[PDB]
Design an enzyme around this catalytic site. Structure first.
Site, PDB file in Angstrom:
ATOM      1  N   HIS B  41      43.362  44.945  47.754  1.00  0.00           N
ATOM      2  CA  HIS B  41      42.306  45.813  47.248  1.00  0.00           C
ATOM      3  C   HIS B  41      40.961  45.100  47.100  1.00  0.00           C
ATOM      4  O   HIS B  41      39.984  45.785  46.831  1.00  0.00           O
ATOM      5  CB  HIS B  41      42.692  46.562  45.962  1.00  0.00           C
ATOM      6  CG  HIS B  41      42.755  45.739  44.708  1.00  0.00           C
ATOM      7  ND1 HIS B  41      41.605  45.363  44.031  1.00  0.00           N
ATOM      8  CD2 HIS B  41      43.831  45.388  43.964  1.00  0.00           C
ATOM      9  CE1 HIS B  41      42.018  44.750  42.930  1.00  0.00           C
ATOM     10  NE2 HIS B  41      43.350  44.738  42.848  1.00  0.00           N
ATOM     11  N   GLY B 137      38.666  41.787  36.298  1.00  0.00           N
ATOM     12  CA  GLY B 137      38.508  40.476  36.916  1.00  0.00           C
ATOM     13  C   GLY B 137      39.786  39.642  36.921  1.00  0.00           C
ATOM     14  O   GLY B 137      39.842  38.595  37.578  1.00  0.00           O
ATOM     15  N   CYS B 139      42.662  40.518  38.289  1.00  0.00           N
ATOM     16  CA  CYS B 139      43.476  40.797  39.486  1.00  0.00           C
ATOM     17  C   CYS B 139      43.671  39.529  40.320  1.00  0.00           C
ATOM     18  O   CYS B 139      42.749  38.717  40.434  1.00  0.00           O
ATOM     19  CB  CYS B 139      42.895  41.934  40.316  1.00  0.00           C
ATOM     20  SG  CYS B 139      42.666  43.489  39.395  1.00  0.00           S
TER      21      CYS B 139
HETATM   22  C1  LIG Z   1      41.699  50.673  32.721  1.00  0.00           C
HETATM   23  O1  LIG Z   1      40.935  51.393  33.680  1.00  0.00           O
HETATM   24  C2  LIG Z   1      41.716  51.940  34.745  1.00  0.00           C
HETATM   25  C3  LIG Z   1      40.900  52.700  35.807  1.00  0.00           C
HETATM   26  N1  LIG Z   1      40.645  51.358  36.396  1.00  0.00           N
HETATM   27  S1  LIG Z   1      39.466  50.723  37.259  1.00  0.00           S
HETATM   28  O2  LIG Z   1      38.925  49.639  36.511  1.00  0.00           O
HETATM   29  O3  LIG Z   1      38.639  51.790  37.692  1.00  0.00           O
HETATM   30  N2  LIG Z   1      40.231  50.132  38.544  1.00  0.00           N
HETATM   31  C4  LIG Z   1      40.880  50.919  39.600  1.00  0.00           C
HETATM   32  C5  LIG Z   1      42.017  50.189  40.286  1.00  0.00           C
HETATM   33  C6  LIG Z   1      42.823  50.914  41.164  1.00  0.00           C
HETATM   34  C7  LIG Z   1      43.813  50.297  41.907  1.00  0.00           C
HETATM   35  C8  LIG Z   1      44.001  48.942  41.771  1.00  0.00           C
HETATM   36 CL1  LIG Z   1      45.242  48.151  42.704  1.00  0.00          CL
HETATM   37  C9  LIG Z   1      43.235  48.192  40.900  1.00  0.00           C
HETATM   38  C10 LIG Z   1      42.242  48.810  40.140  1.00  0.00           C
HETATM   39  C11 LIG Z   1      41.430  47.985  39.162  1.00  0.00           C
HETATM   40  C12 LIG Z   1      42.283  47.622  37.945  1.00  0.00           C
HETATM   41  O4  LIG Z   1      43.240  48.307  37.590  1.00  0.00           O
HETATM   42  N3  LIG Z   1      41.860  46.526  37.274  1.00  0.00           N
HETATM   43  C13 LIG Z   1      42.336  46.008  36.049  1.00  0.00           C
HETATM   44  C14 LIG Z   1      43.505  45.258  35.915  1.00  0.00           C
HETATM   45  N4  LIG Z   1      43.973  44.759  34.763  1.00  0.00           N
HETATM   46  C15 LIG Z   1      43.272  44.989  33.663  1.00  0.00           C
HETATM   47  C16 LIG Z   1      42.077  45.746  33.626  1.00  0.00           C
HETATM   48  C17 LIG Z   1      41.387  46.047  32.427  1.00  0.00           C
HETATM   49  C18 LIG Z   1      40.274  46.838  32.446  1.00  0.00           C
HETATM   50  C19 LIG Z   1      39.793  47.356  33.644  1.00  0.00           C
HETATM   51  C20 LIG Z   1      40.423  47.083  34.824  1.00  0.00           C
HETATM   52  C21 LIG Z   1      41.589  46.275  34.858  1.00  0.00           C
HETATM   53  C22 LIG Z   1      40.120  48.685  38.804  1.00  0.00           C
HETATM   54  C23 LIG Z   1      41.877  50.806  35.769  1.00  0.00           C
END
Ligand SMILES: COC1CN(S(=O)(=O)N2Cc3ccc(Cl)cc3[C@H](C(=O)Nc3cncc4ccccc34)C2)C1
Ligand SMILES: COC1CN(S(=O)(=O)N2Cc3ccc(Cl)cc3[C@H](C(=O)Nc3cncc4ccccc34)C2)C1
Ligand SMILES: [Cl-]
Lengths: 304, 299
Positions: B41, B137, B139
């Protein structure tokens, strides 16, 4: 999201762990530049522990009586001296993996990571706090003496603890890296017991702010308290007195959440009175006191 | 004495963490020999092969400490991107890529911008999520176990679910659980308690000097499983009983005798008491974690 008991990455400390042997006793040492630091009780037998005279035992030893092993390499001891309850062994090789470091003495309530070692080999890393009674609730077996406690800020390792002994209640006592014990403990097999322990109030408040930051407010109430009334209640539950310094230290967490410190003290008073009623706070059914305000700020998000 | 949630020493893994940047996305990578592994991703209903074919090697900025690594190739394996770099990692430890089962524990080295910030211990839940501590951040942060000198990488962080729990893949890019790597309606299934781990922790409490929960009773495996299913506990199998054998021998308490204590704890509560400083039944220590911590195994 989430909240875990998080330790610092241990790599910088792993590269300093060595094994120190004197006669039949083997424990851990910390090799920084050309000096190996270890508990002075490495020169004692079990019989000696009742009333050891460290100056008399030390004067009978030569450099070649100390065997220091770093991995599979023997280090040669070229000097030795005692500083309080630590022995400093001068070696003829400086540690090429010596990180940027400081020796810091911590106060009760402060947290740190522990790299538990046996025979100069690290086995695990965990997080803990200096209790108000100056003991630590660690996880140590025989041979763990000389294991160290530390914090890492930026690239600098701040060594704050060296393990020396286990007390009858299963808790642990040790020194700072200058050999001064935390608490009224002696490196002697005497009737010494940990004082009555108390809950680190400023840390419970910090962890309640961490719960609010993560989205949980069920425990809040519409009340406030004076600092004096809060301490009169807190002392009845064996909680440490909360000082104006503690209130000051909680300022940033109070600003980020919008909940005044004395307003969070009122929720704590009510949690002490009522319990949790089947509810948890950050996955815990007990009020957690081993996260400082600084640990909450470093781990939790800046938003909420 | 003492019983802590202990992680493996993280040094061997710290020497592999790098920062990977593609366009506006920055996350963590794992540098082993001349390959950097990271969530695919980093290139982002995404068509990952279509998104990848538009990129060149120089579109990936890989930073190891203060040194830029030069990407000379790229390929995708399931949900993991493998970036061939010009320099082999001189700190590459002895390693394996292993897929773990729910109930197994591992250490996580949480990283931001290729810099490790903390280490913690966690378990793969029966619902395939992990209850981690991660911010934006994080990931690409990895989970691992260490056996002698070998690091077994078992997890790579990909995302956070709406309940605040975490989802990721093994190092071959296969997700743990029915999760996909994109923004869509995704939710963790109902979780259950890891029974074999609660029993291991009860043995750890006995080893440390706590026996208030012991009783004179025993149970059959079937009667215990009928009770456990009512309290959202995972079924206990004969394999679980076999795995608890050494802890049963060390304490002198038969596994079905400990099951009788657990049945009473589930049916009656703790009555104001704690076990190893906890008012909840702990399920994130495996029988092996209990044995290792109560024996001093080094790495
Ligand atoms: C908590 O907000 C939800 C909606 N999002 S997001 O930040 O838009 N988002 C979408 C997304 C979709 C698919 C994948 Cl594989 C990864 C990702 C990302 C994700 O998951 N990154 C995060 C991981 N761990 C912790 C986090 C903590 C805060 C914020 C992102 C965190 C970003 C996660
Ligand atoms: C739990 O047993 C008590 C009684 N002993 S002991 O092994 O006889 N003992 C006495 C003693 C007296 C003073 C000093 Cl400074 C050190 C030491 C030693 C000690 O404290 N070593 C240990 C440290 N940490 C953890 C342990 C865990 C188990 C067993 C020794 C552990 C040895 C510890
Ligand atoms: Cl301090």
């Amino acid at each position: 999201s989430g909240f875990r008991k998080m330790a610092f990455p241990s790599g910088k400390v792993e590269g300093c762990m060595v094994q120190v042997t004197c006669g039949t006793t083997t424990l851990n040492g910390l090799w920084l530049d050309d000096v190996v630091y270890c508990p002075r009780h490495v020169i004692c037998t079990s019989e000696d522990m009742l009333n050891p005279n460290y100056e008399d035992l030390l004067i009978r030893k030569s450099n070649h009586n100390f065997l220091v092993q770093a991995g599979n390499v023997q280090l040669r001891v070229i000097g030795h001296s005692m500083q309080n309850c630590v022995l400093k062994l001068k070696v003829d090789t400086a540690n090429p993996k010596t990180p940027k470091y400081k020796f810091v003495r911590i106060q009760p309530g402060q947290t740190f990571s522990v790299l538990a070692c046996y025979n100069g080999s690290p086995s695990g890393v965990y997080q803990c706090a200096m209790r108000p009674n100056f003991t630590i609730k660690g996880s140590f077996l025989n041979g763990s003496c000389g294991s160290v406690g530390f914090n890492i800020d930026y690239d600098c390792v701040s060594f704050c603890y060296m393990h020396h002994m286990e007390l009858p209640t299963g808790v642990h006592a040790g020194t700072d890296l200058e050999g001064n014990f935390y608490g009224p403990f002696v490196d002697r097999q005497t009737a010494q017991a940990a004082g009555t322990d108390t809950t680190i109030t400023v840390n419970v408040l910090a962890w309640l702010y961490a719960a609010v930051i993560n989205g949980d407010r069920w425990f809040l109430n519409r009340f406030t308290t004076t600092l004096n009334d809060f301490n009169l209640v807190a002392m009845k539950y064996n909680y440490e007195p909360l000082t104006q310094d503690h209130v000051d230290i909680l300022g940033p967490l109070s600003a980020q959440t919008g909940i005044a410190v004395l307003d969070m003290c009122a929720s704590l008073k009510e949690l002490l009175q009522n319990g949790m009623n089947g509810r948890t706070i950050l996955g815990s059914a007990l009020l957690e006191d081993e996260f400082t305000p600084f640990d909450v700020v470093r781990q939790c998000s800046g938003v909420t």
